[PDB]
Design a protein around this ligand. Sequence first.
Ligand SMILES: OC[C@H]1O[C@@](CO)(O[C@H]2O[C@H](CO)[C@@H](O)[C@H](O)[C@H]2O)[C@@H](O)[C@@H]1O
Lengths: 447, 447
Amino acid sequence: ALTFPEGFLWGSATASYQIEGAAAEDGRTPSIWDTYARTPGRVRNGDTGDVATDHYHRWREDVALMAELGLGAYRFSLAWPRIQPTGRGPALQKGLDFYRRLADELLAKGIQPVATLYHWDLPQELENAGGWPERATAERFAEYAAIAADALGDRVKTWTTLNEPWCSAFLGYGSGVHAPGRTDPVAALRAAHHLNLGHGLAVQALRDRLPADAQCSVTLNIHHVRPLTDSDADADAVRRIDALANRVFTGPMLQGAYPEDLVKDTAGLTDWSFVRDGDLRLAHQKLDFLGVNYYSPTLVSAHSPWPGADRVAFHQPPGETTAMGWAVDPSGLYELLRRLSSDFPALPLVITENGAAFHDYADPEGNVNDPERIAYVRDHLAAVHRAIKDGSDVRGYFLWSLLDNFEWAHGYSKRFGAVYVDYPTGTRIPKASARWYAEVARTGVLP
Amino acid sequence: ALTFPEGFLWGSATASYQIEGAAAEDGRTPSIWDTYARTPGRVRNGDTGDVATDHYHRWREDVALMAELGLGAYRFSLAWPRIQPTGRGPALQKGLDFYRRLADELLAKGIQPVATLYHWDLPQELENAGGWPERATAERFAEYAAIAADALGDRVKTWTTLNEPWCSAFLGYGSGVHAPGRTDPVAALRAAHHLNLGHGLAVQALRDRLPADAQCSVTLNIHHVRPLTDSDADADAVRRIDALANRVFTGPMLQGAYPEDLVKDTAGLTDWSFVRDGDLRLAHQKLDFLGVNYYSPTLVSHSPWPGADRVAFHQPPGETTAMGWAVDPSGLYELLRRLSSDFPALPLVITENGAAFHDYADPEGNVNDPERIAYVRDHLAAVHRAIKDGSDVRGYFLWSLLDNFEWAHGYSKRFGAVYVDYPTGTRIPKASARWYAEVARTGVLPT
Ligand SMILES: OC[C@H]1O[C@@](CO)(O[C@H]2O[C@H](CO)[C@@H](O)[C@H](O)[C@H]2O)[C@@H](O)[C@@H]1O
C-alpha cells in the first residue's frame, strides 16, 4: 500500500467537444472537428459530437457525480466556439455563462476547476483563414485567452493554454487523421510554431488579467521514446523522434529555442523563416507546473506525422494491450517522469491525463465491470509513486476521463471513462473503477 | 451481384440459455450452465444467463423483428430444463407451451421454425448422475426428444438433435472451460461417444413421433484444419486434430464407425470399452441434411484434445474479430468442398456463421456494424462459390439474431444482427440487420 504526498491532487479530465454535445445551441458555431466529423470517412461510423454525453445539459448531475467520487479537482476544456464564435469578435456571454455556472458549482462542491483553453476545437472560420499554419491564429488565440480570463478569472485559478499541441499540429496538418485533415510537412511545422507562439502570448495575457495567485501551465503528451535495439542507428532514431514529439515544444516553451538538431533534421523541408524574431522569447513564459499526458511508450528503429524522420520505423512496444491496441507499460511513465525531473528540475509536474480504453459493457443487472482499467490505473499510479520516491516533483493525477466520450477519429467506439455512458439516453453508470478510484482519492492510499 | 437459388433458406439462430433469461420461472431449474456461471472465475465478470435478453418474456417482439427483416426461418434451441426440470419425469406444460406459442407465432408470420433439442443446457440432475460420460444421459436425451416431438410436431417440421457436441464433450469435460467444467480426457471421450449415441437414439425417436415429411439433422462445428508448414509432421498434426474435432462425430453419425487412426491416437488413454455392441449402428441414422457451423480456420503444427499434446495451435492469418479469431471466408469454401467430397448425398445447411465486433449504440440511437456486413458478405460469397462448384448448400443462418450471453465470455461479445442494451433489454436493429434483410428478400448478394 503506497501513500501519496500531502496535498496530492486527485481528479478526472474531459474535453469540450468530446463530452458537451449541444453543438448548435446557444450561439456556438462549428469548430474544425464539427466539419471533420461530418466529412465522409474521417471519423469512425460517421460519428460526430453533436450530442456526445449531453454534458452541456447534464452538467449539474456530472458535478454531483464528481463529488460522490470525492474528487478534489476537475480538468475540463473551454469551447472557443461557444465563448467567441468564429474565433474573432466579441465574447458571447451566453457561452461563457455555461462555464460560469459549471465553475461555480464545482467550487460549491469543494472541487478545484482546472480549465484548458484549447483542446482542439478551433473555430472553423480560423481554419478557413489558414488555420494553425497561419500566424494570425496565434494572435487570435491570445485574444480569446484574454476574453476567458476576464470572464472566469475570479473563479478559475488554474489555467492550461493548450492540450497536446503535437496532435493538433502533426495529426491535424501532417498525417491529416485529426481535424482539419491537412497533409503537408511544412504546414505541420508552421502549426507547431504558431501553437508555441499562441501559448506564450496566451500566458502573457493570462498573467496580465488573472489574480497574482493564479497558476498557468500547458499540457503536453510527452512521448517516451525507446530504441528497438542497442544499435547506434536506433539511438539516432530515438533522438529524431524525441525532437519531433517533445522538444519541438519543450524547447520553445521551456527553453526559448528550437533544438539545433531538430532544425538540422528538418533542413531539407524548411528554413523556419516563419519563426519571426522575438517569437521564441514570447513562447518562453514562466509556468507554475507542466501538465504531462501519458498512455503508452514509443519504440523506434508527405503524409507522415513525423516531418523529416522518414528513415525511422515504429514498432509495437511489448506488453498487454488496451482497446486502442496500445501497449500497457507503466515503466514508461516512471522513466518519462525521471527524464523530465532531470531536464526541468525546478518545474513541478502534474499528470493531466492517463487512462485506458477497454471494451466495457453494462450487463443485464445494470453493472459495468472494468477490472482491467483498475489494474491499468493502479499500475501507473505505482509508477508515479516510485518516481516521486526517487525525487520527481509530481503534484497531482487526473484520470482521463470521468466519462466515456467521443474519442475523436474513433468516434464513440472507444470507452475511457470511470463512468459509463449509454449514449442513446445519456444515462451515466459509474463503473467498478469509479468506486475503486474514489477510495484512492478519499484515502490518498493505493492498495 | 451473386444470386442464390430462389429456394435457398435465409434465417438467424439463437440458443436457449444464451437469450431466454427467466432462469427460475415457471418451474425451470438449474442447467449445468446455471451452475457453471455461478462458479467464481468460470465466466467473464461473473456474468450469468439469469436475465440475458429477457426473451422468455419478450419473444413476441423478437419474432416481430424477424418478420420485419423478412427472414424465412428461425433456428432456436429448446430448454430441457424448462420442459423436464430433472431430466426425467413429468414434462412441464408451461415449458412446452412457451415453445408451442413461439412456433405458432413464427408460422403466423411465414417464418419456418427450426428447433435444436440440445444446445448445452443439460439439467443439473443428469450431471450429478454422471453427465455425458454416463450412458444413461444418452437414453434420457432420446426420451426427451420424443416429448418435444409429441408437443411440437404439428408445428415444427425441421429438427436438430445436438449443437456442437465437440464443445460439449471436450470443452465441457476435457479442458473444463465450458459447463460442467470437468477435466478428464477419458471423460471427454466417453461424453463424445454418448453424444454420438444420444444423437442416434434421438433421431430414431423423432422419426417415430414426427410426420413423415419432418426433417432431422445434427449441427456440428466442423473445424477446417490447416498445417502451419508443408512438413509431413504438420500434416499428421492436421490429421490428428481433424480426427478429434470432426471425424469423432462424422465417422459414427454419418458412416457408422469411429476412424481407425482416432482409436490408435487415443490408445494410451482408453480402449473404448464403453462403446457397446450395436452402438455404432444406433448412432448412424439417416439425416435429411447436415448442419454446419463455421467461424474461423484452425492452424496447427488441461487440454480439450486428448492424446494430441504433440500438437500446437497458431493464429491463422487475416483480420480478426472481437474474439480475436481470424476472418477467412476461404476456410468456409474449402470446408464445404470437403464435406461435398466426403458426403456427396448429404445436403448441407449453414446453421451458424457470424462474427463478434465491439458494437455500440451512438447518441442518435444507431448501431453501425460495417465490419459485420463485410464478414457476412464475404462468407456468403464463399458459400455461393461452393454452390456453383457443386456443393449442396440449402440454407444459411446468421448466428445470431440478438446480442446474447456468449458462454464463458459472458456479455462481452456481441454477435447479433440486433443490438441489445442489457440493462433495459432494448432491441436496436444494427446496420447489418437492414443489409441482411435485403439479401434474404431477394436472394441477391451485392458484392
Ligand atoms: O525573464 C523572463 C521571465 O519573466 C517573465 C515573468 O515572470 O516574463 C517577462 O518576460 C518575457 C520575456 O521577455 C515577456 O515576454 C513577458 O511579457 C514578461 O512578463 C517569465 O515569463 C519569464 O520566465
